[PDB]
Curated annotation (Swiss-Prot), chain A:
Name of the protein: 3C-like proteinase nsp5
Resulting phenotype, Q189A: Does not affect ability to cleave and inactivate human TRMT1
Cross-link (Glycyl lysine isopeptide (Lys-Gly) (interchain with G-Cter in ubiquitin)): K5, K90
Localization per Swiss-Prot or TrEMBL: Host cytoplasm; Host Golgi apparatus; Host nucleus
Catalytic activity: TSAVLQ-|-SGFRK-NH2 and SGVTFQ-|-GKFKK the two peptides corresponding to the two self-cleavage sites of the SARS 3C-like proteinase are the two most reactive peptide substrates. The enzyme exhibits a strong preference for substrates containing Gln at P1 position and Leu at P2 position
UniProt organism field: Severe acute respiratory syndrome coronavirus 2
Length: 302, 298
């Protein structure tokens, strides 16, 4: 019993965190085999950040300009290449602590763990979700660039995020490990704004099923809804449309609890209309949207 | 910017998790040097009598895909200490510390000696933890990290009928009035950790959330009368002193933040949130707020 925002154990990622210094800029890098991945903006000064030409700035650098530090050991950079917004620094040592890993690009609503680092040292681990507006509501200070987001399903680490920047609203933007940004963001100081954020409907429903599995039923009602009528209501509360894919994904939880997806959708409609009335669901007075259907099953069943 | 429930990096503890199988019971053990610590209920009660009937070979200890050989066994309170032939090469610098209610720690939830998740907890004033544990999680540990030292403060033993959890420090002494047997046990009435709520209100101010601030101040006496009324823990002069640095950083005196908390408790939030929460969060200590809002690393 119990339901917590749970992160993956960070050990396999901690052994990969290194410090990357280039000129005055110091951020984090991800050391996997003989390559250190880091945000390409490490080659910039804050003076050439409005409109940086990364191809031009990179060509002017040599391997010895990049100082890579793994613990108290300096790694020697033997090559450098840029892949989208990520810099790949080839080093002369393969990381002995390199776990089994994949680079995966996630979709909005997907969750992952963040190992927040400063100066190549891990300071904390938290859980978060890729927002529908492609930002993440992280906890990052200056120096956290290059901190990574991951999932540790089975013995393989799936790297899905690398932190690049904080937007004016205090939210965060970054890329997958291939350097492709999530969202319409660019690694420039140009005026950029997070799009209007919306609630991840499928995740709220998954969390409502988690509450039912944990014995909480107060919010359930005798009603059902059509998928269209649910989306017409949900859209009015800035909730993401629920697709047939989401309904299909919620199938196992629907089978385990005996509550049809469209029946849980009617509970959600009611909750949106009424609020909680001083009650909580899994110790929360708000509808939680950072647990996917896969997170709920994993945490509640194994 | 941002404020998240953040746990310590679990790596130093992951290298210590092993599986302990005794008869039909399989749970987790904490392998430090040549000793594996685990809940004594793995032998299940008259624990002295049950333990004397066991031999070293009855305890199957598994560290990854390697079986450790048990060369001795002793009991310290509600923890079983299985002496093994191999010292854990991954043993970090560690201490066993007993925490006080309100203090926070990270929990590395494990099943079959394998870490599945890490989450941040607080030792409730009623000595329970609101964890997330399934059958097989016994022996999962709670810890803090201080520089490069792991302070082990909790080992999970059981779940109470309300879904909350009970366990011991690493010396086998239970937190709370709980015993490790199948009997009627209930978590006492819980209260809110006042000093932690205030710390989280300072974190919200540091993050630009000021709507709840007011011009008023209060006395520690007047505030504690309100705290008693709303099932909030008394705020001591020690708590006020601990909140000193946050008070200095934000310019909001502790008793000035207390008057904000007093208005929040009598009037509510009114459809507003603080750090994306409609409830007053009490699982961030004043130290957690300072560590996160300043970026301390391990
Ligand atoms: O936004 C950035 C980075 C940057 C700047 C412009 C463009 C690019 Cl791609 C990258 C520089 C550091 N940084 C931060 C990242 N996360 C948290 C922070 C908190 C407070 C201040 C800064 C923070
Ligand atoms: O409470 C216990 C343990 C127990 C039983 C009797 C007496 C003692 Cl001292 C301890 C055995 C497993 N267990 C659980 C521990 N945590 C979470 C759980 C969730 C769901 C089911 C069981 C769970
Ligand atoms: Cl995805």
């Amino acid at each position: 019993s119990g339901f917590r925002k749970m992160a993956f154990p960070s050990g396999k990622v901690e052994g990969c965190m290194v410090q990357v210094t280039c000129g005055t800029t110091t951020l984090n890098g991800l050391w996997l085999d003989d390559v250190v991945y880091c945000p390409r903006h490490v080659i910039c000064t804050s003076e050439d950040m409005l409109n940086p030409n990364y191809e031009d700035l990179l060509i002017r650098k040599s391997n010895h300009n990049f100082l890579v530090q793994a613990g108290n050991v300096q790694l020697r950079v033997i090559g450098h290449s840029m892949q989208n917004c990520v810099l790949k620094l080839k080093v002369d040592t393969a990381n002995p602590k390199t776990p089994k890993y994949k680079f995966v690009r996630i979709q909005p609503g997907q969750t992952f763990s963040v190992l927040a680092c400063y100066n190549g040292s891990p300071s904390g681990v938290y859980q978060c979700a890729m927002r529908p507006n492609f930002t993440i509501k992280g906890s990052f200070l200056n120096g956290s660039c290059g901190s990574v987001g991951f999932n540790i399903d089975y013995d393989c680490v799936s790297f899905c995020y690398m932190h690049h920047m904080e937007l004016p609203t205090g939210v965060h933007a970054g890329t997958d490990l291939e350097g492709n940004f999530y969202g319409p963001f660019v690694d420039r100081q140009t005026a950029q704004a997070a799009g209007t954020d919306t609630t991840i409907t499928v995740n709220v429903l998954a969390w409502l099923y988690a509450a039912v599995i944990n014995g909480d039923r107060w919010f359930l009602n005798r009603f059902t809804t059509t998928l269209n009528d649910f989306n017409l209501v949900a859209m009015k509360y800035n909730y993401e449309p629920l697709t047939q894919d989401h309904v299909d994904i919620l199938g196992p939880l629907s089978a385990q609890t005996g509550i049809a997806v469209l029946d849980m959708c009617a509970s959600l409609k009611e909750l949106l209309q009424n609020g909680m009335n001083g009650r909580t669901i899994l110790g929360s007075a708000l509808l939680e949207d950072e647990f996917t259907p896969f997170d709920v099953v994993r945490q509640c069943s194994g």
